[PDB]
Structures are given as C-alpha cells and as structure tokens.
Design a protein around this ligand. Structure first.
Ligand SMILES: Fc1ccc(-c2n[nH]cc2-c2ccnc(NC3CCCCC3)c2)cc1
Length: 344
C-alpha cells in the first residue's frame, strides 16, 4: 500500500503514481494515474464511520452524485473500499481530475466578461438539473465549483444538500445555519430553514458579484453582520417585503434599523456588462418570492449566446431519501458503494 504525507492511500492496483493535492471536506485528496482509462484522476480518502454526522454527509453525497448524471455536476467514476463491512474503515471516491476551483481562480485571475458569462451559464445549467430533481444544493460558493483546463465547470460538494420542502421552511429569528455565511440568503438569518430553491439562487448571485470584482460582495464576520452587509447594498426592505415576514422578532429587528438607501450595482461594478448587473439584481432580490428562478435566469438576455432549453436537461425523476445510527449508516454506505466492487 502506497503512503502519502504519513498516511495510507491504498487505491492500487488500478490507481498509481500518487501526488498530494490537499485536504477535502473530511479527508485527504491525491491525484493518481488511472491504469484502466490511462488518465490522471482525483481521489479523495474519507474516514467517517466513527461519527454519525460524517456518516450522514458521506451517505447523502454518495446517494445524490450516483443518481445525478450531468456535464456540470461532478460524477463519481469509482469507489474503493474493503470487500466486507468489518474490514471497511476508509472509502476512496474517484472523480475526474479538475485543474482548479473558482475560489483559487478568483484569488489570482481577473475574469473576462466572456469567462464570467460562460461560468454563470454552466452554474445555472447544473443548478437547473439539481432543482429539477427537487434537490437544493444549499452550499454553493466558489470553492464548490471545479474547473478543468478548458473552463468546463462542475458543481461539487452535496454534503449539505436536501430535498426541497417549501411547506416546512418557516422558523424563528436567529435560527442557527450550517452553510458558508458569505453566500447565505437574508431570509436564513430571519425566518427560513433554507428548504426552498430560492436560497441557491441567492448564492449564485453572490458568486456572480464575486466573479465581477474578485472579492466577496457580503463578507459578513458573523450571523447578523452578514445581514448588515446585505442591507448596506440592497437598502432597507420595502413595507411589502416586510409584510411577507410574519415573525414579530424578525420583522421588529428589521424595523429597529436606521433607513439605508440602495447602492447602485453600476457604482459597485463600473466595468461590468449592464445585462450582467440586471441579472445580478434579480438574483440578489431580498424577497425570496420575487427572486428570479433558475430557468428564468437561464433565459435572461445576459446568457443569450448560450441559452438553449433543449440542451439544458432535467432529472428523469425527483430525488427522495439525520436520525439513524452510524452502524445502520456504515451498512447503507457499504450497500450504496457495492456496484463498484469487481463481481458486479
Ligand atoms: F484545494 C483543493 C483540495 C481538494 C479538492 C477536492 N476536494 N474533493 C475533491 C477535490 C478535487 C476533485 C477534482 N479535482 C481536484 N483537483 C484540483 C482542484 C484544486 C487545484 C488542484 C487540484 C480536486 C479541491 C481543492
């Protein structure tokens, strides 16, 4: 068994000549040579069986990625694990090797209007498929968008993904959230559990603003600082948008704030394409009921060069699935990864 940075990485005999890439969500990532397909691949090592929540995120992600099949969503090529549940301690996930992610790219590269337009198109095309399967990603951000050498973009990390549940979205003021703060919709800090499609559209709008200036638009440092960042640009919500917030604590918090006027998008982004700013405005709409949907965003004049609904596929059926013990979860992980074992 090959060793990498002091730890075991046994993916052989199919995968050889390992190179350390870094650390993933819950393990080590290496590039390797796939001796069957004769290409270099990405291999993530995961060890989640001692913790129930790590078991839940692993199972969730494996189930979703194995059912999804889309050019703008990372696929699983192979899964390596022991032949028995008793011998299984680690799981190796094999994926296409990508050149970079949008986070790394935005830290050192200025993006042309053509690249921003193409990247946005691919994000929304991938998001249309996810949403068609009644799934919410819930953690869209530049580090969850992978890019190959020809700028093909793939959405990754479905660890926090859920089946859409708009009837059970309501919650109290200051309800704790798990997703990355800078890309959280304003309703999450007010009265939403993030169970509706509109929360992903907000994250995509944040990503678009970031592609325009190479800086997060709302880099809140904490829960309510995040809201102050949003309202400092969008301005105070209207009476109509407040009336949609029934929870007294959330509504009265917004009422207690001094009036803030809107900062025009063309002043924040003077070099941006005017059509890109019109779409940005519609994605970064405070009211989630008025926020643009994924299919309307795809049909926006900014993406006219790419828009083709016949070439923007949807899922063949909606997706359907944590209060389950880790022993049952290890067993479910073992069963989900069975198709990749030799005798299949
Ligand atoms: F910096 C990292 C480290 C790990 C990942 C990662 N976590 N889980 C899967 C991958 C992954 C998948 C496909 N290709 C890559 N390769 C490159 C992406 C970042 C730049 C060099 C490696 C990583 C991404 C960025």
């Amino acid at each position: 068994p090959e060793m990498v940075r002091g730890q075991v990485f046994d993916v052989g005999p199919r995968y050889t000549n390992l190179s350390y890439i870094g650390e993933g969500a819950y393990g080590m990532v290496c590039s390797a040579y796939d001796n069957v397909n004769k290409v270099r691949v990405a291999i993530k090592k995961i060890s989640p069986f001692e913790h129930q929540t790590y078991c839940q995120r692993t199972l969730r992600e494996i189930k979703i990625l194995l059912r999804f099949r889309h050019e703008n969503i990372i696929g699983i090529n192979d899964i390596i694990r022991a032949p028995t549940i008793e011998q299984m301690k680690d799981v190796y996930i094999v994926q296409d090797l990508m050149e970079t992610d949008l986070y790394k790219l935005l830290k050192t590269q200025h993006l042309s209007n053509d690249h921003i337009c193409y990247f946005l198109y691919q994000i929304l095309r991938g998001l249309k498929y996810i949403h068609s399967a009644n799934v919410l990603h819930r953690d869209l951000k530049p580090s969850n968008l992978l890019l190959n050498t020809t700028c093909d973009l793939k959405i990754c990390d479905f660890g926090l993904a859920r089946v859409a549940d708009p009837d059970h979205d309501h919650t109290g003021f200051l309800t704790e959230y798990v997703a990355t703060r800078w890309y959280r919709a304003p309703e999450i800090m007010l009265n939403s559990k993030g169970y509706t499609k509109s929360i992903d559209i907000w994250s995509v709008g944040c990503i678009l603003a970031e592609m325009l200036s190479n800086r997060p638009i709302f880099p809140g440092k904490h829960y309510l600082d995040q809201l102050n960042h949003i309202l400092g640009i969008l301005g105070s919500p209207s009476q109509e948008d407040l009336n949609c917030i029934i929870n007294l604590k959330a509504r009265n918090y917004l009422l207690s704030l001094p009036h803030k006027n809107k900062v025009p998008w063309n002043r924040l982004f003077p070099n941006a394409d005017s059509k890109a700013l019109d779409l940005l405005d519609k994605m970064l709409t405070f009211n989630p009921h008025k926020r643009i949907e994924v299919e309307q965003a795809l049909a926006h004049p900014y993406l006219e060069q790419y828009y083709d609904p016949s070439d923007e596929p949807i899922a063949e059926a909606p997706f359907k699935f944590d209060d389950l013990p880790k022993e049952k979860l290890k067993e479910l992980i073992f069963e989900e990864t069975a198709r990749f074992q030799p005798g299949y």
